[PDB]
């Protein structure tokens, strides 16, 4: 009786053209038990092999046997909760070509899981076989295929039992396309193989072969998933099969992307059963997104947090040692004396301590003899603390020397301290406002001289980990009580700041850019140009002004100062991130505009400056200054005020067109207007009254209907339901209507279309139906209908002259008073956030006019990634250009064509440098070289003058001079300290002073990751780099532009890069070029771009660093018990959501490989909709509630998604 | 660029192909009652470009 | 009991505008012999 296919289910034939085969059925687990086994992160999912088999069955049905499919695609995954209706449909679009698409229409929306083409395109040409005795003997070297499957399952996507068959394999090597596995249907799958054209389980295993084929030694943290195949063909039933050919053509070694496999299924005899060509796994995103991700997973910063002291008190017997060092101040006693007194009093038990008051450059014998007074017989007694005391709040030009002396003092004293045979004491260090913490009491007034210390102490903490190197920053208004408490029983914390009456601790935080660090600028609407544009299409709460750098008009252009624009349904659609993009150019907000001409183009003569103007344009009209094509603007006749003109445009310009120049409305012609109360509807009402027609209409809620009836227009009916057609039919005796200015979608469309009576005109202005392939029934057209479509914006862009004439006509008519402008309700343009809300919910009637603020309203606008980077008419100076990264950055600047970049270094260039310079000059860059030591003020003055006196103002700088050197604590010499100190400190300070007056746009100061991380390789470099870090913070505090970068190493794999990646030079130059070009635009002062999130030394930092917030978090091995998280609903559900926050962040951390905050967005760090797959599946498994890949996007922030889950679970709790 | 005026008289996939062909503002004039009286389901969407569909039948008009 | 209906073939809900139920059944004395006896007008006919 029943013979339906199991996956597809029913097959029903439609005779309507284009001929369509519609397949419907259930693919739930309850029906097909075996389906349950592709638990991706422990949740059932339909394998792509299922899509392949289903497409093959559809092709066989439509074209009989020996017909195959091409260019398959997979688009979304599935969930298969219990039951899952599936609606596979195939259409005969044109003879000889067909299309096949599978989608699920549950929950009220569709999801095109896979698209296909089933053109037969096959002939009676049997495929050739393969030689068993050859392929088997070629690659017999065995490999643990079953263990490979087990590890691949552990990787996150399990296979269960039904998807077995893939047998222990053999290959020439791990990394070659030679895997020789064997495939057989598991016992539970052998039975029903007849119905299928090759079991989806067998095809899935055949695919799965690619998992072992790619790389047997797969790297941890990588996930792959098949995505589409270029072609397919099924030759014979797979009642029996042995192996699938392992022909792979992967362009691998990038970790992901594809593999372009061509699997061929063949039996024991060598004959082939099914052929697949062009198989790709895990495509990911475009190259631009790859570079964007590479920036997320590297930017670092010093994150500070507030906490309480868990020490409370313990251990006792705090007989530490103290040294009052470099305290040349008149009265630096209080800090040391108070600390000693608190230690004596509050310190439990005996707390004897002594002071080795080694002042700055006290006396020669103090180097050793002065220290041995206590560091000889009782050295390293139970703990030591260094106190540095206060200092002046601002730096003098000569203050640099003092910092050098301080670093010399620290290196000497610490080398002496570390030279103790017995176990070393923990090295406390208290410094006064030498570390910049956070917006809470942080900014200017940082003690620069002490600032360089941080890097040295941090490198020490790695060089000699035995002496725990905790260092504490302190503030005037913190009081010494909790400071003494930290001294006494301080827990294992490395770097902390007592910035106020509160404890602050540091955690190296992976902090990608966002929306709070975009460069802010001060603009004036009166003459400065700024635009409005949604930052995050979808949540209109993010509307924010943006600088627009008004460009002077060109030929055929005008420069109009907007006075008021109007919302329009296109604006609403774009605001909610729902516009039907069609030309890879997202439309800007606003369509119309009314303002005054401020400048005149070259080739234009229609109008002059100082004259009013109106019209619409693309490029966004929600601006203070707008530059639109001159041909697309109409002078305002004297009658119209600005308000009337803005209200009329796009209301009459639509209504007048549709009803007059297309439908040719005449006296006594029945008209039907949908959504009359809207602006377009109101214009239509006015037009109909003017031309003398019977004005039917329909509205929304009853209040609007009553209001419209108050206007005198009789025959008002509800628009929500289709009932209006019948009612109007009753009230007209059959002659329903002659014109329909439809603007609603859905069933109403058909009713309106059928309403017309033998005259025919259907002007359609809606947008939902047309961009949806609404596929209307064409039968009602038999009675002389005529269907129009009227998209005013598109007409304006393509046929400016016609819309220009139309606009002139409507304005002239409005001035004469024959037409009345609709009702208006102004809003301040800065308040667009709520205004858009009214339009969508339709509580306000009439056109919403936005009144752009054109006044002296001084404000802060935000410059997006489109920021001033390479401006032609300015000079750029690069220091140390003649060596290392300088050459590469100089070449990059030349490529950008920057104007007359100045290049300098400390010495004459080498012959290769001269060759590169002359070549770049020949390339067209007007680069000029200089020389001299940057540590000299004269050199800086000469450099700044040369770049300025040349005639091109200097605005960009890049101080990159540095030389890499290696040293260890003991052998660190003073000359090394000086030669590291001068290039960074003195050069940078001189550059800042000399350039202080110029109109700079950035200031890039290079640094090393050592100052941030701490590498035993070098310690002298760390001090100078930390100093330049703090100096950059201070400069930003002063308000001048600045940006400090801490570079790192080249490879993320260590020395294995030579074998696995090959010898390469520099520090990932191309990778860092984009990072620099981006980071120079944003505002954050300090940032560390270093290859972390997986790297050799990270294994060491996590151990030696008590902060180490990056962690490893190797606890992803969830199990069946993990469900208890749902069972924790016994506790209060609000508190349950509070803990759900932590669940979410922890689960996200493993996939992201780093701890993220709960306030930012997941998309910021970068997830290829595969990190999204993991997150969604894990959320469902750990909570039993599902969130669609759509609703996750809007709630991209951890807080948002947590609140959404809390609500969607409290609803269940209520049930 | 495509065509502008299409005085179609074919049926089946021919008219569907024609409707996609014409450029912006093209006016797809129709005279062949065959497809229309069969309640063909026109793939309304090529109207994206501001097309206009007419049906012309001399006898009924008269 | 049996999902298919003898006089209608296979039920299918098409989620189009408007929603349609399309069945595409088959009938015939060749397979549904019980129709043969109702030979209306001395010719095979649909009851």
Residue numbers in the entry:
A (entry chain A): 892 to 2106
B (entry chain B): 1626 to 1687
C (entry chain B): 892 to 938
What does the paper say about this structure?
As exemplified by isoniazid, which targets the enoylreductase in mycolic acid biosynthesis, mycocerosic acid synthase (MAS) offers a potential drug target by producing part of phthiocerol dimycocerosate (PDIM), a key component of the cell envelope.
We also obtained a map of the modifying compartment DH-ΨKR-ER-KR-ACP (3.74 Å) from the same dataset. Unlike the shunt product in complex B, there is no probe observed in the uncrosslinked DH of the opposite protomer, indicating that the reactivity between crosslinker 1 and DH is facilitated by ACP binding. In the DH apo form the active site entrance resides underneath the ΨKR • KR domains, providing no access for ACP binding. In complex C, the DH translates and rotates away from the ΨKR • KR to enable access to the ACP.
